[PDB]
Amino acid sequence: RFGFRDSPFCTSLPRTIMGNDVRRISYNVFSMMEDIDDVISEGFILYDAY
Amino acid sequence: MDVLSKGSLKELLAHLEKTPLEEAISYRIGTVPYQNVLISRNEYYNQLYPDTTSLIDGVSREGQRNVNGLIMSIISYVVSGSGHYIPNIGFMLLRRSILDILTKHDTGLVTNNLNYGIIARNLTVSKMNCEQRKRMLICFKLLAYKDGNQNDYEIYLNQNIPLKQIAPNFIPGDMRTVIHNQDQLAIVGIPAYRLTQSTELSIRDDNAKSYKLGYVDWYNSNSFLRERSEFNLIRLKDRDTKYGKLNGW
Amino acid sequence: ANRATSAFLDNPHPVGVNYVDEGSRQFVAVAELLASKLIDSSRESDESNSDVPFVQAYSKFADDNPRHLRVKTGGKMANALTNVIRSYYSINAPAIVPQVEIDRLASKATVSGDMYNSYAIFNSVPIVEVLSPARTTVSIVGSDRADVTMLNTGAGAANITFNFGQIAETVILKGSVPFQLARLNQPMPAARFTYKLRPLDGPFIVVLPVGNPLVISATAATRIQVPLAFNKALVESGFQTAMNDGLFDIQNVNYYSSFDEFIISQYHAQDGINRVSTCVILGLALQAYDQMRRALPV
């Protein structure tokens, strides 16, 4: 709507992208993870924090 | 009032040692114990309020001349603050302390035929509260130890499940058990809640609140003994001591 | 009609009503924790050249330093635990231990006295009653696995009624030869070896032909809320020990082959819900008695 280039704003954070469910990780679980480099190769959604 | 204020086993037994039997006995005629009556409670109702009088009320009642009435007068004094009308007992018995009657054979009173179940029923154990039942059980244990009826006391506790849970733990011959005991036996005391100058419906509750309100006045009266501020003025014989032992214990 | 019942379900005796408060439940949990450390500290000292770990553990448990020429008995905690176990079994047993001693011993460790955070499975089979017609013989043998041997000498087939109570969750029935079983007033299915039954479903009718004896083996599972520290193996050995040292010797009480039988028998009483709470506290106390006595035999 605003004409931004590569807009970082979504109307709502999608549940599925290209027909595939997006991983949802809590912040507390994300803190203790050891394979973030592999995890970040596919997008994830972070919640349970401000 | 003074007997109802005691909150520990040590204080209760100490008071009974210094209190003669004549304090338990009342010289007012009172009324017959078990009667369905109508009393006036104008703060709540316009009509007369039915109730049943009992021996554990705070007001003196007429008592039987037998030994059963004497023991039942002692327990009512401990749990309710007043005794019953049993006259012409005699100088020899009346001058003895309450503990001596309950625990000593030299008094000349024979109490081995007493039935704890009948005494409890006549005293309306069902109407008693937790502190009142604990105080009565103390009297039963002292009587059982005097008569060598320890086994009978235990069986009576086994029959009555609620009485076994609240039964105080002390050996009536050892002072070490009394000091360790931490049961709270106070009936009147300084109230943490809001206490108002209002009436109660039943005879027992109304009479109990009179002692509670009287104790507050007694606490601030000049007759009350303040250990924190006037410990040196107390006589040495009756001064509080850590190594306080009842005679023969 | 002839009535047959399981032996261990007959007349459960009343349990004690003392030491069931939150303060006393904390003491039982504390004793179990300190008994576990006594076992572990003894093994560590055995595998080392120093006795300091055992001295420290025993000093906390017994409130006294161990001596070479004196028997290590456990001190006041051992005496309190032994008498408290006696009170739980029977209402006739006295309550000797004062509340002050229990509260003081409960302050040695920091554990919650919760007795309902977990569950356990007990394997006793509650055959309340088996009703059989005339000219038939029914025999019930066993508690962990119940075998019912039934014979029909009559002219025709006989219907036997099985009642498993309402407490057990699942009962598994196995027979020597295929047999027919169905609920009351329901069509009877085809003969098969095994039946899975919910005891709540109702009394079960078994068709008994006149040919040969039929033996039915029953296994049951029931779930009772227990503290997380509960260990069935340690409780059973503690139960066997406490019976041997006479901790359960008191007038007018029943005796059971295992703690599994004891808890299930009391559960099936009229006030079974109230009784199992006391039996659960007894089980944890028996667990502490097992560990404490194995480390300090007397």
Place this chain on the structure above:
Amino acid sequence: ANRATSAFLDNPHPVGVNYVDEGSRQFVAVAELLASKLIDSSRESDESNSDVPFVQAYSKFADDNPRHLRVKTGGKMANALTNVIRSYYSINAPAIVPQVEIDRLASKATVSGDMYNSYAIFNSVPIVEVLSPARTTVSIVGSDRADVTMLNTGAGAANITFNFGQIAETVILKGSVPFQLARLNQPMPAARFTYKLRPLDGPFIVVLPVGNPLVISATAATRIQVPLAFNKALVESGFQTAMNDGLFDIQNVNYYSSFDEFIISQYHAQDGINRVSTCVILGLALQAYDQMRRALPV
């Protein structure tokens, strides 16, 4: 001629063919490891007067922070573990859990997932058949201990053929009275109480004299390859919980008293070598169910 067989060996139902791959077997191993952390964290949190150790353990297991006003079901791992247990028991049970979720849950820990690095001994007694002639009666009762009662009503000694299968390693036979037993085409030894047998040796013949009935008690041992984390006590407890919770409730299945009976029955069926591989994975999953449910009752 009469034929008698063990009840639990009759008609083993087919087991599931899903969640047997390497990634799926890692998920079961991860679930068991993380569930055991839950129980230990609960006991650690009680002594430390804090709920933090239990919170972190639950967060790892359930991928969600605990909340006071929410029920602690166990998260997605609990749901996935329940569904895989259903799939293993029967081939008719659907495979609801997707493969992506299994792989994501297996990344929490670094366990190998091997199910053949250890062994366990199972005590179910397999009696495939007991061949008896006319005028004799034979009954078999029991699974962990099989008691065979044979009575001879005729006028001569009867020979009874015993077949224990080819799977069991050792079988120990004890009689109520001394008796004679020998293999095919072998001389009869003197009567004695106890016989040690190898089931692969062949069919055995017991001389049954006329008179009082003879009862033979059979005990067997079988070795099955299991993971190192296998614990028979936890597996048996988890089996009863799964049966009571209805995870095994599905049409066209056979129920058993214990996991020992279930695994032996499948191993004696045809293609039973492939079946026990799936049953062992089920046993480890049942171990995780028992630990998780006891830490988080529902």
Place this chain on the structure above:
Amino acid sequence: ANRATSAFLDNPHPVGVNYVDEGSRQFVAVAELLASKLIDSSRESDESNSDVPFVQAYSKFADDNPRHLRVKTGGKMANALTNVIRSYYSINAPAIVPQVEIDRLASKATVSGDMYNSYAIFNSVPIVEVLSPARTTVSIVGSDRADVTMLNTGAGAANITFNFGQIAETVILKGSVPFQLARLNQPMPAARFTYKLRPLDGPFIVVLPVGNPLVISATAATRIQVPLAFNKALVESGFQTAMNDGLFDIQNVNYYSSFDEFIISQYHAQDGINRVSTCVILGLALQAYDQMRRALPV
């Protein structure tokens, strides 16, 4: 008169007389301690995805570094532990391990080597003899739970004498129907379902009515002094492995279903106290055998 006896109590074979000294006892205790560490390192290696914890534990146990393309048997400790188990079972089994090898292996860890610190409860029920009149028939089945089936075909009631020995501490009797039991020269009480008995008290008499057969179930508890590290679950598992691996098979030896039966039978034989002391060392050796063999399946 007819006499009936338990099967497992018949003809106990002599135990070995080697490897009972103080140094030999230390070797078994060291083996048990090292085997426990072997199985703990195996679990740790699986959960850590590194073989370092297992390599360190195997090197101490086996005296050599683990190497691929090798069997990983267990080194000299495995051979010594296997051979001492053979010697303990039978006096005919040769003693192969030299005392120099035993002493060298006993120096790996510091242990007390005392096998009488603690105790264990054993649940085999000894029925030494049952004496019955002519008309009655008595059969005894079972070892852990003994079921005695008695039937009276005579005109009147019969008296059955029960002898449970003198070693057992407590025996609990349960019947299918209420029965009458009393000691010698004691009045007979009213019929009850269950009795609790002390075998030391004396022979017991059961009144057997004429009507229907009566089955009495017996359970017993016996206390035997064992080391503190004793674990009945591990010992029983090791006993079955020992039988399966064929290190108990020698000429002229009785065979038993469980280690409970083996130890109780030796207790009731002549010189039972000395026999039981050797069997305790075998039990600890079997505990070490089970842990090491499960860690290194050979």
Place this chain on the structure above:
Amino acid sequence: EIDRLASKATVSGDMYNSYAIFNSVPIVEVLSPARTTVSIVGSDRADVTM
């Protein structure tokens, strides 16, 4: 649309927090023999006339 609307406020979707008491009377069956008449009326208060 459901996901977009659910993001407007943050509230636990838990439906097992508490309990409610329901007062319907489940008379599944009333079996009566011959020559007897039975009538069942009501749900909140079930009135069975025999």
Place this chain on the structure above:
Amino acid sequence: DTSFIDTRKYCTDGLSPREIQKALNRQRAYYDRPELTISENKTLLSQSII
């Protein structure tokens, strides 16, 4: 600790758990094992508590 979940009090008396963590990590470096994970570090660093 800085984590919002962790409300424990970490004692500073006695041998520091960080010293053991440093010693343990050096041991793993010799054997070429991976260093202690975040979960393992948190358990070790929280051993000393009040």
